[PDB]
Design an enzyme around this catalytic site. Structure first.
Site: not given
Lengths: 238, 238
Positions: B143, B128
């Protein structure tokens, strides 16, 4: 359909990239001092030039006229002065920085308007593991500086030209078997310590690097821009 | 010819990657809680599973038996708890780290022997922009930690399995339009500030991310391993 200009396209990585682009159906022009033989062999248009002296804008103009457009620019020309900083002269420093960095800027600046006109473009600069390290046992401070500078240029141009449909990235090949790198491969004190850090245990063939270059010069990179992509057999990860 | 397992393969990025692999002629199996409909639509083998609870080794075994081998592993399963660190419970922290990181390790560890047996393998973890940043206006500390941890795992596994013919990389998609990211797209205070930093001026379609995933799961990545490849429209470069 896509028109591409590849500098340093008669041998080494540049040649491999030109071949990969021709394989994709691209109309390719290769630039180097004596590209005639390679161009005939690859099926590309030869553009003789000395990029260490000739105006980069002129080369782009010649490419546009020879290809009937310009969508892709790959600056794979290579030169080096492998001397430590304290031994290096300013002229040598400038020779390396000019060909690798200044010319990168000038070529891209000249090519962008044509890519923008077409609404689609791909600029691929060539980096190195020295974009992230200093070359280890090899004395290449000027080269290291230039290849690292290219990451900044890549980000800068990618940011400004994204809306124009142009993607700009930095392909960073690892240790590759080419004539250019022979001085490293022939010296045990250099080859051994370097190779011991390559997980795959071998140097790359130019064609293996070109497979990724082709991707960065195609639709696969539609949403990929302003990034460095290292193809080094695991060297940097080691 | 190549056999692939894609987790989180019924929707979003995972689904797009599965489709891209099928398009390449790969025999694909997709895993998710309810993959039946998607599998029939994509032309893949469905492997129902709750990766937040079921033993990862078991899923790999089921994939091997369903495909008759295993060469590719893509861990695209997605889950999140978007809460600041001081509000986040340890259970929530563990939920995110387990699915994204621990399962990544367990799946890869189980798949490697089969890829090694075949002498060719591709492991693709999904990162990401939070592999390099902290998510900006979005509160996603767990995350962020997990997606950054994956870069270390990527390097570690790439280093150890390179000689076995396995390549391990981390595809880092930028802001993509999927059901998973709807909470971000629907909130102006999140979408506007984020999008203003994307040079291309738009979020990606899952298929655009999958184009690159396919490359990292093929022969193009023969000399590409232990690296993160960001496909973010220029976000990180901005």
């Amino acid at each position: 359909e896509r028109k591409a200009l590849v500098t340093g396209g008669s041998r080494g990585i540049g040649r491999a990239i030109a071949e990969a682009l021709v394989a994709r159906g691209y109309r390719v022009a290769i630039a180097s001092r004596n590209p005639e033989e390679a161009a005939q062999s690859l099926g590309a248009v030869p553009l003789p030039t000395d990029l260490e002296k000739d105006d980069p804008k002129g080369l782009v103009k010649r490419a546009l006229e020879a290809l009937g457009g310009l969508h892709v620019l790959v600056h794979a020309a290579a030169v080096n002065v492998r001397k430590p900083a304290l031994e290096l002269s300013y002229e040598e420093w400038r020779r390396v920085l000019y060909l690798h960095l200044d010319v990168a800027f000038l070529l891209a600046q000249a090519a962008a308007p044509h890519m923008a006109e077409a609404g689609w473009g791909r600029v691929l600069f060539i980096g190195s593991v020295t974009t992230f390290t200093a070359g280890g046992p090899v004395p290449i401070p000027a080269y290291t500086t230039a290849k690292t500078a290219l990451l900044g240029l890549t980000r800068a141009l990618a940011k400004e030209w994204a809306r124009l449909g142009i993607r700009v990235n930095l392909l960073c090949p690892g240790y590759v078997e080419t004539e250019f790198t022979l001085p490293l491969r022939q010296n045990p004190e250099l080859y051994e310590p370097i190779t011991a850090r390559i997980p795959m245990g071998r140097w790359a063939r130019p064609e293996e690097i070109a497979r990724v270059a082709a991707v960065l010069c195609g639709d696969e990179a539609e949403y990929l821009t302003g990034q460095a992509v290292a193809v080094d057999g695991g060297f940097l990860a080691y």
